[PDB]
Design a protein around this ligand. Structure first.
Ligand SMILES: c1cnc(Oc2ccc(-c3cc[nH]n3)cc2)nc1
Length: 282
């Protein structure tokens, strides 16, 4: 079926939970043996969110190459993404090592450091220009260059220096700061505006490594971001845009990382965002 009228049909019939459970039943199951090794327990935020072995990002290190991160490669759309968990106190150095090694330009953050009165990820970037951060385990330095605070999000320019080689690179940090503590946003308009800002920066483009996108677990809000981006790109590429099937795209993405889209409300919100974004395109 088309998207906008499939949508009304699920609203009127109140069957979003049944649609979402079908997805969960059909989703791929692949091994995640490296994630579950005992030496990697303190590298995982949640015991039930792990990268598949076949798509995990490897750190370029001979001691321990593990990080909870997955490469989502979308072949028809010609977009790739790295989805990862919010860094832990003992993995902040690994996080920036990955950014360096994978040649990423942009980092997309979809959570606040504290939500619901608990810590959802580490404070892994500097807050003041004059107070830079040094990660000694991976030999990197990170400096805040500038910061632009808007009503729904904040953009930061960062400098990442590899202290072994004295090379430097400019990283863009795109921080969506207004996703509610419970549920999903009432309108997709600010989330779509945010996506377009990321696009406009070049951070999604083939001349760079894959964007790094995270929330707390790196599957819910993160899955919403890449699912919408990919669907909109396909609607621009194809002769028949009504042939884009959001459930089929989601299942393709779940071949690369488990659990993408965590609730039926996130599924419905993803539909809404794609429907509204297609118009604005023309
Ligand atoms: C340079 C300096 N310090 C570090 O390590 C840590 C950084 C932040 C936290 C933290 C505290 C509450 N939320 N996040 C923990 C450890 N890494 C590089």
């Amino acid at each position: 079926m088309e998207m906008e009228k499939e949508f009304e049909q699920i609203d009127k019939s109140g069957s979003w939970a049944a649609i979402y459970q079908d997805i969960r039943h059909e989703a791929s199951d692949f091994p995640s043996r490296v994630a579950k090794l005992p030496k990697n327990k303190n590298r995982n935020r949640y015991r039930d969110v792990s990268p598949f072995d076949h798509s995990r990002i490897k750190l370029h290190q001979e001691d321990n190459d593990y990080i909870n991160a997955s490469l989502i490669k979308m072949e028809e759309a010609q977009r790739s993404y790295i989805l990862t968990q919010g860094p832990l106190p003992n993995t902040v150095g690994h996080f920036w090592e990955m950014v360096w090694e994978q040649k990423s330009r942009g980092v997309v953050m979809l959570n606040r450091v504290m939500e619901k009165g608990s810590l959802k990820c580490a404070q892994y970037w500097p807050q003041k220009e004059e107070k830079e951060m040094i990660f000694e385990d991976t030999n990197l330095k990170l400096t805040l260059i500038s910061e632009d605070i808007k009503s729904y999000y904040t953009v930061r320019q960062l400098e990442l220096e590899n202290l072994t080689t004295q090379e430097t690179r400019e990283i863009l940090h795109f921080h969506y700061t207004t996703w509610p503590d419970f549920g999903v946003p009432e309108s997709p308009a600010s989330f779509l505006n945010f996506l377009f800002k990321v696009r406009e920066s070049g951070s999604l483009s083939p001349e760079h490594g894959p964007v790094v996108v995270h929330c707390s677990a790196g599957i819910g809000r993160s899955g919403t971001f890449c699912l919408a981006d990919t669907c909109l790109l396909l609607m621009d590429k194809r002769k028949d845009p009504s042939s884009v099937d959001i459930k089929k795209v989601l299942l393709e993405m779940r071949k690369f990382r488990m659990g993408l889209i965590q609730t039926a409300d996130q599924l419905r919100f993803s539909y809404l965002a794609v429907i509204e974004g297609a118009k604005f395109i023309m």
